[PDB]
């Protein structure tokens, strides 16, 4: 009977959310996997759509009362196809996966038997866990072998992939990556997949919006299946999708196989509130404004990358074609673990990241979140300068601490006696003075 | 830059959500897996918590900027333990699983190797897909064998489980079920698990709130691991949890194993907005009001069950100890598929369901959703009467249609010429006159 | 360069063979799995057939020079079909498996995927390791679940097998057993297999000769596939065979699959010397004398069973339909391992065996001594000699303080051993029976 | 009841053995995998050892009556250790495997779980089926990936193996090969295995005699486990052995694991007759005459290799370090299957073999004819006879219109066959060499 609002029911959680909102506002959020979703997405996600149970697909449901839920899921499917410029006679989409990892695992389950062979980009070389690392589900239930970047160039070693694929004979080759700063040679992937009769998939989670806006090459010209999250580059809620060819691929009806793998294979009832949010975000993904945003994402990342290399940083692969840079900190005399911490103390949020030639040696930096807030190229050049000051503080601290462990560094910088506190505060002040000039979307 | 509300950005989706809200309001929602969550849960779920990326656990994260996210997840953990009256020195909880199915699959991944042996309640006998049916993930990656209800009684055949477990030698035995209307003999489960050295798990998704309020027996006195959804009986957002013993169980550190299985095993970054919602709902789960609600859930289901059996329906297992009844329609001369459809046309939402002795022969009916709205025992007796009128319409229609297929029935009842339309409308009018007397929670 | 006989080339090996020859002559060999093969089988096995490498099948060899090997292999196949009264348009046979376990494992490899489900008779209830039964390779690479004997009747619990198969859904059900003293209800097995869509196989290793001689029921009326060893009741060399229907079964061409599973799947070149000896024994398996022998095997076992019952021993299932009995020694106050050792010291050679409920039983078989010419009256005498052996075993057990079977072994092996004179006296009786009878062999 | 000799009991089998004996005498047997075993081995194999059921290990048997079988099995083990110059505190050996493939499969079963990763030499690059290499059982139950020969040098591409193993992470790397004409760089294999934490095994089936005689390098200095057949270069009966370190390796007690994998894992009762013959051959493998024989094997192969090069044939890797050559016939304008058949019709028995790049090659080995007493000069004559055979094969191919190898087989098998006189003339030369030489055997 009692139906209180959040501030009425639970002031501790309301206070935490407000603090998180305010932290987001005050900080340079440079995590490449983050974005700020819109008020409309949040309202859709925070709605009574959460209440409906609806196993199965539209028109073929396992519970009553699904008229409107079916209209929504159909709408969401249609908008997903339109956003990626897909003919619905050639492609279908499943919009129920709960996230990017389950989306991938549904594909594996759909087209592979257990212990079938998969190749994906190696985790230290920029790939994602769900492509194989036995640490990952992918590696537990299937037989994965990585392909790697050239350690000397930071570019995918296509010739070595071609030789290793002929020996290992994968049934699936996954393109796509977490921390790969360059565009993929999809034709080369297709050639290599065909050389062994493999399925070819793209996990476009990190670049989906850039693909939708035609800033990057289109994997849909070459691959059989495309998976994605919906919250990064797309600016949507936390969800996942799987796109598939409708024509049979190596004698497999991918539509049935994938649908069956999502439900009843791995999931129960879909999260309709999320599907609502998704529908909202895919409408916006078709717009000229979204296309402009994505060009600005890439322009901002380039302005950042250029200013970083003026400060003498090394960038894995020499630069970026997309929304992220991977900085190799080792030639500047430090690692990503130490740097990440100091930057975070100064309200610059990003992540340490392994670089080729393995504590991780790099940091990953992305432009989408702050681009959403309205920062342009000039502001991204200032971000680079601020990151530079933070790396200089980190080098000074690494020098001053006596212990040589990462944990010794941590203890040193988090101690109340920390002698560089004033430099951190001073950097934090400038970080917040930049970030707080810009609005932040959301309810 | 553009940050419109939902009605501003996307009137088609706003209109669908409103329609869904209004359908929920007008209908008797009797799906046992559904509930109406509170305004506070929705506000937490529809918040900027969705924007944060936070791989790992509190205090041990893989990205910067997680001060408040960590405070929230710790809070959520603490409230989960308090809601189930658990000592934190004996139990831990992981609150990141994306739903009930992934939660189960994380447990399997944590404590089993591929092809290890699992026993769970058979799907036609009331179990859930994720316990094994090769249709399910559980059955694809592991070796499942069902245990069954007595087809003659509708009660779990404990003696046959005990004999079959000695022969099959499961490494895991799962208690818990989708459509089991009685309480579980947990001591007997423990005895049987010990007889073969198996792990013992309870999937309490369908009864979690009843367990929290001490209406049913406590699986935590007997089992090693407990999984659950958060949206059914608990009245929370769409999520999942896994509870585990902290003492080693058959030489396994369940805490590390389960945490590792959730991430990096099966999932990426947690859905913090959902964790927010969850925290909210677990606060309310500790309250006297929640305890009263759960006693009313069970009282309402009993009033419904008693009125149904006065109309001469057969109930699987003879009745119910909980929030649901499973009606065996075969002795009344009809199946669940036909009945479900007519009821749904009259705004009574439930689901067809297999009954023991296999189109499915039953319907499953639950009290939580309408109990939340404020219906008492008298109103549930009226619900039974309304269901009875719908079953009578369904029998009349089954008689009048010429084709003997379920699809022939469907075509007949959905046709504009449908000769019993006036009886359906008349029943629908009375259904809506009941439901629209009560408020509905949410934003 | 110099091609000496064995006694000249290697007197130590020659000596050991001389000892074993003598041991065989002096003992009562009652291992149900043993027999005495013929001079003719041994001559083929010890021939120049051992020199030829012949991977593939008759007329499709990976090596040259196999004209005569192909001839032999086909002859061997036609004699296997004839020995079991099989129409060649309905049944085929692969005579390449090296033994029984590899024969079985080749069938699994042929018709199953890894981790597919198999049921067979539980190991303590008379099963073989390579069946339903992680100890065995069958349980390692596949998912096995046992079915058991009804412990109160000592018969296969077909009612419980029907129920458990319905839940477990095996892809393959295996009948046949090492220590099952009754015939198999094949129709009931077929009914059960068909209820789950399973392949049905009989492993007839222990009873193959009795099937060939129509003393027991014919698994070929009902099953899809039959495996066997060639050395036990068939009295051939050590090898294996796989029989299979030639009509497709559950969509599988069993011929193609089984042939590919044996080679290149699990083996290389066949053992052509073995195949030579196998052909010899399969010719003999068609003779009236072989049918007479097999009838005597069963009658000898019945004579022994009945006399052991007169001595108040409990037989699993109350007797036997075949060549073996399984004695439950627990009611007599001792296990099978202690008894096996004492009997062995008095030249009565059998084996400890699990019974329904250290092993509680011994398994006793008639084929080997029936080959040598013993009749029913001699088998009653064998039962008396066994009984005396069991009494000495009981007596030796009471002299032992430690309850560990290793302590017993140590006690009885010691040169001091205080019941040595009882054992010698028994041994004298045992040898005085045995040494009246010829022994086949080179 | 009546124990006749083979010629009386079964004249048809006797006849076939007579034919094969004659075939062996008249032919040049050049299958690298064949040899001619001794009269003494054959006498042990054709003995009463075949009658004994002996599951378990020396002194821990599941059956009674194995006093003398235990004696033999231990003798056989000590002679295997001695034949390969092994300290018994560091190495153990299991002499029960029935053949080479089961030996290998027992090792996998012992130290690996199902779907664990294995690398071995690719089948078209000279590997054996039971290795790295779904065709083989090794590839069915485990996850195999091949390593290959550098196609421009015909040597193992160790640089590419080092890279691919780093990515694939095999739990087991297998050295050894059916058709590899050079010695193995064991130190480099050890280095590679250690880089991924792999077990390292050598399958020495093709070269075991040459290792025993120290003609090739010793895999025992570097590997964890060695498997072998007993019939090829060892000149024993058909069987297998597994050698293993007794110190723990990557946390595994290899002795316990391997013994359990052979029995009860994959086999039943051992073949004691085979073990008898194995003991005989292992005694001979320690003699100076065996070392002299093995040196002659290699010299004969070198004499043949060099003469084939004078005839402008391409040998894979440009020659050989061992008992075999692998001829790439593609530059000469024909495949190995056509050539194998023609050579076989002229009593030159070898096998078609894949080469790097229908099989393009033939494999030729010296052991069998060196056993009979041929020297270097005779092996040069063999190369000349092969050359003539290849010319007739080319000529017969031009008379054939269809490009299918089955059409060729049909052409040459036909009684009309118009090059019959060329083949007879060659055959006369081949037999006139062969029939000057004795043949060992009973």
Residue numbers in the entry:
A (entry chain A), B (entry chain A): 82 to 214, 220 to 444, 449 to 533
C (entry chain B), D (entry chain B): 82 to 214, 220 to 443, 449 to 533
Q: What did the original publication write about this model?
A:
SHMTs are α-class pyridoxal 5′-phosphate (PLP)-dependent enzymes which transfer hydroxymethyl of Ser to – typically polyglutamylated (polyGlu) – tetrahydrofolate (H4PteGlun), producing Gly and 5,10-CH2-H4PteGlun. Here we report crystal structures of a chloroplastic SHMT enzyme from the model legume plant, Medicago truncatula (Mt), which similarly to At has seven SHMT isoforms. MtSHMT3 is a member of the α-class of PLP enzymes, and its overall fold is typical for this family. A subunit of MtSHMT3 can be subdivided into three regions: N-terminal arm, large domain, and small domain, consistently with other SHMTs.
MtSHMT3 crystals soaked with selenourea served to solve the structure experimentally by single anomalous dispersion (SAD) phasing. Based on the anomalous difference maps, at least twenty selenourea molecules were bound to the protein, often via extensive networks of hydrogen bonds.
